[model samples]
Target: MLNQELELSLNMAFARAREHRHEFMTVEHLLLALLSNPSAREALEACSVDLVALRQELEAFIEQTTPVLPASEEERDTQPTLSFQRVLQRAVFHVQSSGRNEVTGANVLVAIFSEQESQAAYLLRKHEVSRLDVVNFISHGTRLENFTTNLNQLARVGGIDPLIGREKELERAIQVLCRRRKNNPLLVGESGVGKTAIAEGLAWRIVQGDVPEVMADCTIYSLDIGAGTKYRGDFEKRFKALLKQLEQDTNSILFIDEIHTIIGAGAASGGQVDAANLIKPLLSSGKIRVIGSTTYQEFSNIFEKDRALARRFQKIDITEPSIEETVQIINGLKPKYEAHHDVRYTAKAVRAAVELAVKYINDRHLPDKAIDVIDEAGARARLMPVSKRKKTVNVADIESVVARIARIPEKSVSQSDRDTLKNLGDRLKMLVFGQDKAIEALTEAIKMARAGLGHEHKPVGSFLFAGPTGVGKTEVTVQLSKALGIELLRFDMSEYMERHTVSRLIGAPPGYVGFDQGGLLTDAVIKHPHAVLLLDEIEKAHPDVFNILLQVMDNGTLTDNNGRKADFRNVVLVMTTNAGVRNSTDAMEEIKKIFTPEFRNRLDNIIWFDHLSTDVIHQVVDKFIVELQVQLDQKGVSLEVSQEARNWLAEKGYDRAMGARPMARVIQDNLKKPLANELLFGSLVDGGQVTVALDKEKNELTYGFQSAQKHKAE
Candidate 1:
């Protein structure tokens, strides 16, 4: 028996042939009628066929070529062509063989393509509609299928890693799935925090027959949202077909990873039906259970706005795993990484990977970050020279890989770098003069943090360096970064004096220019997790900038406009203030006047700098002279300054208030200026020597130039 739509199409074709007085009801008349059939037209449209053009072409060909009955014939009746009967008979045979109860117009449409010489088949071929395309479309959009992947099958085939730990999240999600109503569960968390893993974990549990009786036969299908959906209704049709398959399979559960992307999915224009709306009814009725995963940012910004869609699913938070949990995860998955990289990982190395990743890799969540460390560590070892590569990866390999990931120096990341810390203060003192107490305090705070005695959540040291300018206040920070082999992120606070400009530090707020670009301070700290961040002339910055730093100093994190946190736990934050340079007695009071109590209360320490003593200025002079001697050596010349001459220059350059800054200028003018002319044109131009001495009796200094040969003769 023909279906109602196919019967209607055949009747319409015969009626048209009678109205035209054609001798036969041909294939062209059948095709022209099939154009109006719901099933057949839908199939043609899915194949992107031009239905109007095909109809016009079929009508024109039939009118121009079909034989018309003569008016003189008494018995005039439209008859079915042999080709047309063959098409219908073939359609019925195909439908019966395929076990369908009735032949549909879509079935007849496919059968018509078998007639090689018929104009109906020729027109369909001209419109680029193939038999396979019609078959696929009538068979429920097979060409656009494969959007749903069978995760249970993947788990059964050992394609997925065994989920290490996420017991509570999986249990929570399972509980939601087993509910009588609104059985869909939405897993929300930061990226790389095992949201998708929880879904895959359930599939694995079901495959192993470890699930509850109700879920024992369940199959999990993950939505791919694959590419190649080009036309207007392509994605919609594909997604709908996927939903239909899922609906028919009573044991299937659909998992949509990054489900926020489906909020307005398939809506080519405004107010069109989207995937979210299409699934809402199924999600609420509990006819088909769904599992969704997305980040917190997307949940709030996109998914949360669609109240109808958001309400149907129970939200489950997937937090980042603890360091110990991450270590166990790495341990469980260590064998897989080892097999891939062809290098064994030590138990100590696995622990080191988790710890180092948590300590240094701040941008990504744990477990994923820790897993990457061991994976990359193995690869690093495998890529090394045959002799140098170890069969097993050690803690050093983990440390080096983490250093590379965090973009910090390997020496700074090594926990066994005791020599650097032991000589930290001495190294700072050698480079920066007149800040002994400051250097001692800075190094002590750093050492306490390094020794695990400082607050784990706060920055290593958030200090306010208050003192006279040119007294090594900023210099101490610069040299400390150098000594520790960490980067120096210096921001002159004077640049952030305006309230509007303060936004530039953390990135401009949304809706403003440059909002897409991240904050300077945040980007720098993110790039270099371990560093000395110097805010020079801190008092010059607007108070709003201080408000932003308050969070960084206390919580060890600063989130930018994009909600990406910059970790400051390993940073040595130094803010220098010259507010009380003139009066050492009231320096603390001056600092208090500039900074609020809350701001001052969070500080680890306030290191003060004093004026450079006259005697210290002599040491500064010697430091300067040695540096000058090294420069002279580069030019094939030797420089000698007598002690008396040094004393004379120190007396001329020393200022009680200016510290060592004036000394540099004095040396630049009195020594470099004189040597500049000598080296350029004087006897000292070609590999010679210069001796500077004080003539006490004459109260003046003299320069004596000696040729290299003259020095050998002496």
Candidate 2:
């Protein structure tokens, strides 16, 4: 009696108008009918529908006064709506032409807007869905949609940010996809670089009818490879069953994220079969289209191992997002968060979250840390209570959230950090003994940086300690790192004296072995940006080494062997050289020869360390003895020294030329060595106190429990 492709929606509308006693069905009846069909409604809405006007204005025509319908009515006076009949003709022609026994809703929806006469169906028609899908179902439809997830539907309705700055990668993925054979794509990238985004991006694009004709009717389904059972052959059975549906339909694409699990990059014979292998022949024959993603490590470890699998896909690498790109990603996702978290973010709060994450959240790539902050910020704000819910997140709140996670000190600054900076001179003086002149210059420059007076783009401080070996040049830097509550990244320049070794400092050159690994200095800075960086025996380093430091000193940044930029602004660079030790006057001349004048000019202070004296060595011995006492205590023994023994030690170890190192050796051999041996095998017992007393009678040392007998009597 009527074209069966017509929706019951239109039939119902005709009945409603007939019930209202209209002589014939009109366009108004059909237009309102379109509103009930979701596909039609979505199309109309996307084209800027005025639903309120469509309702009031169009419905008024439906209510026109009319005589009631008779049991039978005249049929010939303009019975069919002019534009609606054209669609029926096309639907019928396509159905018979395609050898379909029945037409579907897609058929009518497709033909309804074939010529732009149907605004409500315009966008729906633009999608290459209707005719192919309608005939597809009518012919052999055992739809296996249940076996897969519709990413395209979720993306359109759920709405995600567009993948930005990924055109080249996208086009490449598609280029591989469009190939007639071996068209599967394998995406290898860091986990957070949004490999999954590209998958969804392609899905959304396909849904928009932006793909080639063969791919036009395709729907993207994210296949959960692990969804089936794990009982030996059970997985293979379920996967093979899922593939059966794909074999039956040509309009489906599969996305498997972290696909290493499906492909098991290392899967060899007897390793249990994988869905990847089972599906390989289908992918090669272009019977199935697929895209897979996995981490870089898994790609390295297993991706190429199966040459057969590797040849099946075109590999595309996705790298970690840069800081600037991460920031933009965070900002783009803010609306999505704000909607769910029921809170708003201030601009300062967002930027601070980025900066805080960039500095403290080591071990994670960008955007991951920044996103975690905002998520926490939102969670903490709403935890207050329903009535007193915090609606705004500021930078301070964001910092508190990260501080709690990273276990860093608060924004108010922890006492340890404050204390480390507060007594810098006093704490460093313990090790750099008697180098008051050098220590003073070092401490002052560091204090200036801590006070926020250092060059914003430069390092916290840069100082050259010029003194002879063993005169506390390197020792000062070590103590400075300790005083600042950070690690001492010590580099011995003698090892870097060669020009080739200079490359080792920044990184091995490209294509060289160990190129994937970071350079020693660059990795150290990246890990502990806030630290004392000590270049010991600096003058011995190759002249080319100073070239690397130029940018480090100028911009507080260094590019690693891997081309990763490391921030060094929080670092304190100490270059210890015995350049001026030969003669204070020629120290400058010697440095100029060893390092470029420009390099020399970048140093904040060129403090020359004084030669170690007996008095200074005496002070140094006291420290060494303290250490020895601790070691003895650990063995349940104690050590004490008299003034006579102290002088005996200083005089024995004293050598202005030898510096404190020999003094340390002296204490080690005289006090710790004998005591340690005695404790282990001789007279010293655990929990016993042993004192070093001078044998004034002989001007030598004796180790016993008490002072010399004559000194006690005196």
Candidate 3:
């Protein structure tokens, strides 16, 4: 029954090939038909044909020997066929005798023809058998129903489709392959960017008979170079066998992936020949057309040893898709992801993922890093339980993930802290009134530091507050320390004017190892790990400081003179600079205009503080007066700032070049003198009050003393 089935299937395959006008039925077609019939399956095994191996060997053989027919004539002719019984007998004999089961289609066809020839010779002498009879018998016996079924099955499994978006690359590759070009075409790109896929796509096209005339006779064979490492003994032997397989089969194209590994210089231990050297002979002799793919770095570093090898292949660079393109890819693959993972992602969730990627790129300096963050965050979200739906990735989730990836910490300010900060802001506002811009600038910096924006370990909060000296830059730093619960370590840059001054910050030179105190900034970061480090007059410091800071700013890791890694990522490094300050007030004004553009570009933010104005001086006076009255009330006394005294102080001190510092001097000189004199000069009194008036009518400031009652000395 098995033999009869094999015979019937072979007839069907041959008839199908003839109906299609094909010149020959390939081994693949034969095996596919035979494997589908249970009876024929047994016959195939009995012959030791190993249908699968036979199919592969035959496909490889067809790949080797099939010649290109003119397009006009290709569709007109019937495919030739051989008797199944004759082919099987020859295959069994070859396998049993040679201990090799692999039988090419060419061998089977030759055997059938040889049998017919012998019979014909015998018949010619006896006047019985004829060549036409043999031909008719082979053609009528051929069957193709199984062959068509197998093709469909293979198509379903392979997911074969027409190549898209790589026409140019395909054409170029085909040209090289068909021409047997001297250069090995190297396809270099990031993983998953379709380098190897392109090779496979080309192979599919060739199998489908769409190849150019020059390539019509060629078969594509994908040889994974990575697998080459596993072959024992003579690597050349395996290589030669591979080539011979291609040659006997004829018209074969070989594709080696990670082809860089083949170049001679990159050798594994045990002295195996490199893949490039092993294949050099076949390549040079134009015996095999090879296409190779690898990464740019791998190609340059591992391959390219012998110019001859490198020169053999044209290099094509492949790039990753843009974010928009990536999004489309992700969306298309979403169904697969959902099906595989058993989860549905809403459109909003997908958008959120993309947004997370955008935010990461914005903060981390690269989109590549952002891509990973999106993937990891999605994985993390999946692992989190649904009952904790709140944990589902939202903006905050992305923010938290970004911060974690960037190594930034989260911090919050309490109401009390805000109120205290407000109070400090008020003082700065009062002292430097008309300069709300300056006051607001300083206030924000303090808030950033307090809210942990610039902590030592995550020093992303560092700022360059630049302005003229009297414009209140230093005062802002002071106010910040007072407002925030952070001790400010202020270092005068003037002290570090010389290169040798670096020792003051990092301690003694390396030879004096025992005496090494960490650099001032390093020590502060190490100790406080959360303090504000103010490098006052940054530009005055030696250039070495800037060089040192570049590393610290970029990596958040600072190495001490002792070669220890100091954690400064937590510290907020505030470097104040008056380098651009001009002596002329007008010149200074011009400087401020351009200063931020130049300085802030590097600093991320340059907060400019302006000079104090008249109205600001009056607010300062009012604050002082209120404070004095409160102090007097506590002492069972009262003091009033007369309109005249307030006017005089405002007019005289408001426009002073000293900024907020002038206000302090003005308050002390005008109030402290008279207040102190009144306390000492007046009779000991309780419930006493003092009033100071600015006598605008006489342009004179006056002071008056009053008391509720006289008190005897205790």
Q: TM-score: which candidate is best?
A: 2
> Which lDDT value does model 2 have at 156?
70
Sort by TM-score, best first. 2, 1, 3
Go through the candidates in order and give each one's C-alpha lDDT. 0.77, 0.66, 0.55
Q: After superposition, how far is residue 600 of candidate 3 from its true place, in Å?
A: 4.8
Ranking by lDDT: 1, 2, 3
lDDT of 3 at 431: 45
lDDT of 2 by residue, 455-475 (tens): 767988888887776878777
Give me the displacement of residue 63 in model 3, in angstroms.
Answer: 44
Clashes of 2: 1
Model 1, poorest ten-residue lDDT window?
Answer: 508-517
In model 1, the runs with Cα more than 4 Å from the true position are 1-149, 155-186, 190-194, 197-256, 259-292, 302-420, 500-517, 560-565, 582-588, 634-636, 642-658, 662-666, 680-682, 693-702, 710-714
Model 2, runs deviating above 4 Å = 1-176, 179-198, 205-212, 217-416, 455-457, 497-523, 542-548, 559-565, 582-587, 626-648, 675-699, 702-714
TM of each candidate vs. truth = 0.51, 0.56, 0.38
Which lDDT tens digits does candidate 1 get at residues 499-561? 355534653335221221245787889899999999888888765678778888877887763
Candidate 2 backbone collisions, by pair: 636-687
Q: Per-residue error at 49 for model 3, in Å?
A: 56
